[PDB]
Design a protein around this ligand. Structure first.
Ligand SMILES: [Cl-]
Lengths: 175, 173
């Protein structure tokens, strides 16, 4: 195994090649919360922050709390498009939007092709998280080149937002 | 050229695979329940069952919660029939729905691990329902033998409960 995520008392392999700094994002064919096809081209000419969560119906285990911390981080970086990807159905993603708002956040489901998981290095095949996307964050520029990527080693953890902030500040003070 | 179609609003979509018929044994499945536990046919031992595929527990009028509630209402007269609901929803969403919508006894199974979809003849591949389970109902006995099966032709329709009731009544007599 290349990677493990801790979920309560279980330690589960995470499978596939997770994108790294300097990589171009792998292509994807997903479906959004209104059942529309979503590809990288759907988010053209914008930098983005891609986040995989276990599901929008988890709370402490890589769910709505982590999403919330990520939204809060992005108060400082309004030009960064937040793209949330999960195994949830489009119908459930639409319900989450209705119930929680999630302004300007894209919500994408892997149901149209679950091979997204291996291609993005977030595939879990063991009980109890079999079929889920392991929680991860990827910062990419408008050319879809990766500047930062991290997979969580434990589902209760938060991403290293301080590390992402430092990269964004360093870029800004350059320009 | 298709064997079956489902109407979803103004969209008419092919449904793919071999749908179980009267006298068939249920095909095996390997699903995951709303508490993230493996669920196989043998998980529902010694019981007749009513298997329903819905689009999602988070749909309302389109083969979703309204159809689920009508199905459970119908089953109130048939205390031995276990209701098993299967969707593409996540276990996490199914668990939330159970609490949010008051569904204490139903088995709620996710297909997240489309092998099921095709083996049960409920697979949709076309926009905008690509990857969903087409809505359907299967009545099976404790031997897992099918007594009645129906795929909805339109997502806003109800199953033919009258036809199911008649078979169950003819059974009890
Ligand atoms: Cl119930």
């Amino acid at each position: 195994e290349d990677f493990w995520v801790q979920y309560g008392d279980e330690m589960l392999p995470v499978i596939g090649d997770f994108p790294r700094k300097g990589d171009y994002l792998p292509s994807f064919m997903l479906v959004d919360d209104q059942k529309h096809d979503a590809a990288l081209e759907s988010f053209s000419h914008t930098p983005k922050l891609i986040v995989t969560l276990l599901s929008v119906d988890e709370d402490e285990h890589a769910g709505l709390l982590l999403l919330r911390e990520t939204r809060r981080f992005l108060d400082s970086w309004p030009h960064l498009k937040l793209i949330v990807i999960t195994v949830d159905s489009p119908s459930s993603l639409a319900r989450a939007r209705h119930e929680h708002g999630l302004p300007n956040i894209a919500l994408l489901s892997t149901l149209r092709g679950r091979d997204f998981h291996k291609r993005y290095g977030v595939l879990i095949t063991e009980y109890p998280l079999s079929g889920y996307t392991s929680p991860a964050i990827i910062l990419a520029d408008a050319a879809n080149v990766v500047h930062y990527s991290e997979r969580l080693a434990n589902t209760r953890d938060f991403f290293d937002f301080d590390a992402i902030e430092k990269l964004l500040q360093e870029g800004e003070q350059q320009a």
